[PDB]
Amino acid sequence: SQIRQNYSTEVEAAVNRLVNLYLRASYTYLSLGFYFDRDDVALEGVCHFFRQLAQQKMQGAERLLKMQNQRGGRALFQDLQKPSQDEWGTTPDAMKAAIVLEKSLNQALLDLHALGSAQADPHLCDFLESHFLDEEVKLIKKMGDHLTNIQRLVGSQAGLGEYLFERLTLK
Amino acid sequence: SQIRQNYSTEVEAAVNRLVNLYLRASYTYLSLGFYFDRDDVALEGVCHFFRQLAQQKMQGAERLLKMQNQRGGRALFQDLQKPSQDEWGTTPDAMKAAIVLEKSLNQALLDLHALGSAQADPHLCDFLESHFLDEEVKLIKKMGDHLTNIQRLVGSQAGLGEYLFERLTLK
Amino acid sequence: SQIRQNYSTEVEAAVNRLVNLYLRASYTYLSLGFYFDRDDVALEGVCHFFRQLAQQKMQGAERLLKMQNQRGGRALFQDLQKPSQDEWGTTPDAMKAAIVLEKSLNQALLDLHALGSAQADPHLCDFLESHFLDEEVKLIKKMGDHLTNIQRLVGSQAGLGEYLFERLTLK
Amino acid sequence: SQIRQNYSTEVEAAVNRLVNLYLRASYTYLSLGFYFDRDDVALEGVCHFFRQLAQQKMQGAERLLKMQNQRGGRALFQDLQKPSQDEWGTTPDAMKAAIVLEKSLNQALLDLHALGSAQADPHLCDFLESHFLDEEVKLIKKMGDHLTNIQRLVGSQAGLGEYLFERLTLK
């Protein structure tokens, strides 16, 4: 490559794995979104929440691919495993699942940052910090808030609590 | 002092004590606000309510200090005791606590007004009346209203009532 | 905590100590501001300078508390020690004091950053860099500039130099 | 009088004396203003300061007369003694004189308020509080600030300090 500089093969590979992880998260959220659009589920604010997250993860993938090219590395795609469930249960089940998913993305980010720090790759480390690590922290906090509110509502009376949460918290 | 006139040492001292009381109330509300921002509490309208009150009490302190200087007295600061609790319970627990706190500030105002009246200090008495006594009455009435509504809601079903109050009453 | 991830107990504790330090700095600046509002001191541009800094430090505290909650840690407040002086001397005395105070806040930031780097906490490290470390550097430079100008003016003729600095440099 | 109610002859008389005091203060400020307009004094910001105060005191007189009529009392005017000096010295001399004058007006206000309180005349007491007592406190604080600044400047080098104060503090 005419441009590649201070960009290790280990980081290149790790960035390709992370792209796969973001794409797979996007796919997961797409499934979650359309489950909540089912006529027998019918929670539009929940559908919209997860569809917006599908878009966000696809944007993260695209930003990682842009950077891979900026650095002179080469994007390599792998098969995308389908989401872990076909049906996602109640709102709290789905929010727990999303938190698990985001924590796994955050751990992959942290691992990538440790690797870049080990390879002395300050551009990679700043990239991740600027665009990814704070967005994860903020989203996980928002999801944790939502879980606490859903849990508090479905303790009381489950159907009514799910409706109220979708109507009064979700867009 | 070149400006001091009809301003007793007793009032000067009492005004410094009241500044400490307002600052300590501010600190209390700051704690209350951030407890309701915890991911395992997660009541944003409650957080916002108490953060606005923290700002209001700090403003009261600053107004008392401005007056102390206008009169030729001298501000003296003391240590600020931390708030009485680390965790604030449910919304009704927190609102009861705030009412207790505001009643104690109102009693300090009333005591200061009695002292100024005993010292024949009509400026002090008008100052307190204009900026402090009516604001307290109004805030305590608002808090009492909120407690009545929260209590009526958490009698029914506690988690659901707390959510509805934060969503439909609080900003 | 349902959200906590890669957030050590050491950092949590250190962040709570830093909140105390920012609050105490705020309190210090509040005292400084109101001393310069005394009728026998009467330097309005100096009062305004320190009152704006009191607000800024309170904002720093609030941002640290927001982050502590975003990460799943728990805010704990301690008593706030009163400021180190009741009377702050001349403008140069007060500016020296503020520089000492800001250097101590900057060292606490640097210490916290070293701890986060030791605990491999890149979010904490980016947080501090983005919001705190550059603001400190910039403010200390501004204070150093002010001290140099005040010192150059009060070498000449002290009362006149203090007035000119407040009128022609301070807002 | 068809309207007079709870308005003692003592208060009526005291209000007429206070009108005389305000008019005489106005006259004093008029003299002060025109002394600073002399070609051999020539401090325009000082002239403007005292001319604005002459207008303010005349406004206070007119407000006291409006109230005397609102209450059913009867205005009675007495001769106005000329100001205590023909020439007013330096800026600090003149500011000291104004502070002495305002303290004497404030004491007359306080005396009138004590009398109204003794006669159980709450309208009079609120009138004085609303329109007069806080305006005095604020003006005396402003004058005290000015004296401190002038004194600090004329300690250094008297002619230069007087000029700088008129240019950089006064409108």
Side-chain angles (χ1 to χ4, degrees):
Chain A
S1 178
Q2 80 217 327
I3 65 163
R4 189 171 182 156
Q5 184 178 205
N6 196 217
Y7 195 59
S8 70
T9 61
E10 290 88 350
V11 165
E12 177 181 17
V15 170
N16 285 331
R17 290 192 293 269
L18 192 64
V19 171
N20 188 264
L21 208 52
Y22 270 76
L23 264 5
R24 189 176 170 196
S26 192
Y27 205 7
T28 300
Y29 288 131
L30 183 77
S31 183
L32 274 157
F34 283 99
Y35 168 79
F36 284 99
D37 181 60
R38 286 178 35 168
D39 75 275
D40 65 345
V41 177
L43 296 159
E44 179 171 25
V46 187
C47 171
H48 288 168
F49 183 73
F50 284 126
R51 288 197 60 193
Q52 292 151 30
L53 287 179
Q55 173 176 60
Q56 282 172 44
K57 293 313 164 188
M58 178 59 73
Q59 292 169 357
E62 281 166 355
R63 195 173 248 116
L64 286 159
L65 292 161
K66 173 172 162 184
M67 183 272 294
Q68 176 81 286
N69 277 340
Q70 286 178 146
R71 299 302 301 279
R74 292 294 172 249
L76 289 170
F77 298 98
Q78 300 304 333
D79 298 343
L80 291 180
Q81 292 302 317
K82 69 177 181 181
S84 61
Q85 299 171 223
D86 291 327
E87 296 181 307
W88 296 99
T90 57
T91 302
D93 293 326
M95 198 65 52
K96 296 185 199 166
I99 285 169
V100 173
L101 183 60
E102 296 300 329
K103 286 178 176 205
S104 76
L105 292 174
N106 198 216
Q107 190 60 63
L109 295 167
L110 290 170
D111 288 348
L112 182 55
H113 188 290
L115 173 66
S117 154
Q119 296 284 331
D121 190 336
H123 179 276
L124 175 75
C125 295
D126 178 52
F127 174 84
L128 289 175
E129 284 162 12
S130 299
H131 297 300
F132 289 87
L133 300 171
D134 195 31
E135 289 201 5
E136 280 312 304
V137 163
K138 288 185 215 176
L139 178 66
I140 291 158
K141 172 61 160 69
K142 183 170 156 185
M143 291 178 168
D145 289 355
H146 290 348
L147 220 203
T148 290
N149 277 282
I150 303 154
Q151 292 174 321
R152 137 204 300 142
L153 285 162
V154 305
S156 295
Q157 286 191 94
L160 166 81
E162 198 148 350
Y163 177 74
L164 284 176
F165 177 80
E166 180 267 338
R167 291 285 100 182
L168 299 177
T169 299
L170 297 170
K171 294 170 176 143
Chain B
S1 178
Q2 80 217 327
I3 65 163
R4 189 171 182 156
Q5 184 178 205
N6 196 217
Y7 195 59
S8 70
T9 61
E10 290 88 350
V11 165
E12 177 181 17
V15 170
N16 285 331
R17 290 192 293 269
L18 192 64
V19 171
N20 188 264
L21 208 52
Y22 270 76
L23 264 5
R24 189 176 170 196
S26 192
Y27 205 7
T28 300
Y29 288 131
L30 183 77
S31 183
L32 274 157
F34 283 99
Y35 168 79
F36 284 99
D37 181 60
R38 286 178 35 168
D39 75 275
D40 65 345
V41 177
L43 296 159
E44 179 171 25
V46 187
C47 171
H48 288 168
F49 183 73
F50 284 126
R51 288 197 60 193
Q52 292 151 30
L53 287 179
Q55 173 176 60
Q56 282 172 44
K57 293 313 164 188
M58 178 59 73
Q59 292 169 357
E62 281 166 355
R63 195 173 248 116
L64 286 159
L65 292 161
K66 173 172 162 184
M67 183 272 294
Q68 176 81 286
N69 277 340
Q70 286 178 146
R71 299 302 301 279
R74 292 294 172 249
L76 289 170
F77 298 98
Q78 300 304 333
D79 298 343
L80 291 180
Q81 292 302 317
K82 69 177 181 181
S84 61
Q85 299 171 223
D86 291 327
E87 296 181 307
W88 296 99
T90 57
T91 302
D93 293 326
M95 198 65 52
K96 296 185 199 166
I99 285 169
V100 173
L101 183 60
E102 296 300 329
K103 286 178 176 205
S104 76
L105 292 174
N106 198 216
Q107 190 60 63
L109 295 167
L110 290 170
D111 288 348
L112 182 55
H113 188 290
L115 173 66
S117 154
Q119 296 284 331
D121 190 336
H123 179 276
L124 175 75
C125 295
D126 178 52
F127 174 84
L128 289 175
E129 284 162 12
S130 299
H131 297 300
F132 289 87
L133 300 171
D134 195 31
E135 289 201 5
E136 280 312 304
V137 163
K138 288 185 215 176
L139 178 66
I140 291 158
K141 172 61 160 69
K142 183 170 156 185
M143 291 178 168
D145 289 355
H146 290 348
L147 220 203
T148 290
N149 277 282
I150 303 154
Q151 292 174 321
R152 137 204 300 142
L153 285 162
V154 305
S156 295
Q157 286 191 94
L160 166 81
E162 198 148 350
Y163 177 74
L164 284 176
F165 177 80
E166 180 267 338
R167 291 285 100 182
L168 299 177
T169 299
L170 297 170
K171 294 170 176 143
Chain C
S1 178
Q2 80 217 327
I3 65 163
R4 189 171 182 156
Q5 184 178 205
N6 196 217
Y7 195 59
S8 70
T9 61
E10 290 88 350
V11 165
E12 177 181 17
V15 170
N16 285 331
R17 290 192 293 269
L18 192 64
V19 171
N20 188 264
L21 208 52
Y22 270 76
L23 264 5
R24 189 176 170 196
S26 192
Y27 205 7
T28 300
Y29 288 131
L30 183 77
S31 183
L32 274 157
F34 283 99
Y35 168 79
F36 284 99
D37 181 60
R38 286 178 35 168
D39 75 275
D40 65 345
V41 177
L43 296 159
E44 179 171 25
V46 187
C47 171
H48 288 168
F49 183 73
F50 284 126
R51 288 197 60 193
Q52 292 151 30
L53 287 179
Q55 173 176 60
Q56 282 172 44
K57 293 313 164 188
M58 178 59 73
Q59 292 169 357
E62 281 166 355
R63 195 173 248 116
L64 286 159
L65 292 161
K66 173 172 162 184
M67 183 272 294
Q68 176 81 286
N69 277 340
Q70 286 178 146
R71 299 302 301 279
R74 292 294 172 249
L76 289 170
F77 298 98
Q78 300 304 333
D79 298 343
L80 291 180
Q81 292 302 317
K82 69 177 181 181
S84 61
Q85 299 171 223
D86 291 327
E87 296 181 307
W88 296 99
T90 57
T91 302
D93 293 326
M95 198 65 52
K96 296 185 199 166
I99 285 169
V100 173
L101 183 60
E102 296 300 329
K103 286 178 176 205
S104 76
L105 292 174
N106 198 216
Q107 190 60 63
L109 295 167
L110 290 170
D111 288 348
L112 182 55
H113 188 290
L115 173 66
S117 154
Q119 296 284 331
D121 190 336
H123 179 276
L124 175 75
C125 295
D126 178 52
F127 174 84
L128 289 175
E129 284 162 12
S130 299
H131 297 300
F132 289 87
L133 300 171
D134 195 31
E135 289 201 5
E136 280 312 304
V137 163
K138 288 185 215 176
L139 178 66
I140 291 158
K141 172 61 160 69
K142 183 170 156 185
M143 291 178 168
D145 289 355
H146 290 348
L147 220 203
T148 290
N149 277 282
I150 303 154
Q151 292 174 321
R152 137 204 300 142
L153 285 162
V154 305
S156 295
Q157 286 191 94
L160 166 81
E162 198 148 350
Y163 177 74
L164 284 176
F165 177 80
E166 180 267 338
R167 291 285 100 182
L168 299 177
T169 299
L170 297 170
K171 294 170 176 143
Chain D
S1 178
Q2 80 217 327
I3 65 163
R4 189 171 182 156
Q5 184 178 205
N6 196 217
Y7 195 59
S8 70
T9 61
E10 290 88 350
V11 165
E12 177 181 17
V15 170
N16 285 331
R17 290 192 293 269
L18 192 64
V19 171
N20 188 264
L21 208 52
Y22 270 76
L23 264 5
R24 189 176 170 196
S26 192
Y27 205 7
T28 300
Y29 288 131
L30 183 77
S31 183
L32 274 157
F34 283 99
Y35 168 79
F36 284 99
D37 181 60
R38 286 178 35 168
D39 75 275
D40 65 345
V41 177
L43 296 159
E44 179 171 25
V46 187
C47 171
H48 288 168
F49 183 73
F50 284 126
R51 288 197 60 193
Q52 292 151 30
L53 287 179
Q55 173 176 60
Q56 282 172 44
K57 293 313 164 188
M58 178 59 73
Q59 292 169 357
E62 281 166 355
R63 195 173 248 116
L64 286 159
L65 292 161
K66 173 172 162 184
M67 183 272 294
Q68 176 81 286
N69 277 340
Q70 286 178 146
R71 299 302 301 279
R74 292 294 172 249
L76 289 170
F77 298 98
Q78 300 304 333
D79 298 343
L80 291 180
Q81 292 302 317
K82 69 177 181 181
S84 61
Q85 299 171 223
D86 291 327
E87 296 181 307
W88 296 99
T90 57
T91 302
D93 293 326
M95 198 65 52
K96 296 185 199 166
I99 285 169
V100 173
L101 183 60
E102 296 300 329
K103 286 178 176 205
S104 76
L105 292 174
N106 198 216
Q107 190 60 63
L109 295 167
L110 290 170
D111 288 348
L112 182 55
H113 188 290
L115 173 66
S117 154
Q119 296 284 331
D121 190 336
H123 179 276
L124 175 75
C125 295
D126 178 52
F127 174 84
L128 289 175
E129 284 162 12
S130 299
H131 297 300
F132 289 87
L133 300 171
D134 195 31
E135 289 201 5
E136 280 312 304
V137 163
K138 288 185 215 176
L139 178 66
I140 291 158
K141 172 61 160 69
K142 183 170 156 185
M143 291 178 168
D145 289 355
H146 290 348
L147 220 203
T148 290
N149 277 282
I150 303 154
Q151 292 174 321
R152 137 204 300 142
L153 285 162
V154 305
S156 295
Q157 286 191 94
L160 166 81
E162 198 148 350
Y163 177 74
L164 284 176
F165 177 80
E166 180 267 338
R167 291 285 100 182
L168 299 177
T169 299
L170 297 170
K171 294 170 176 143

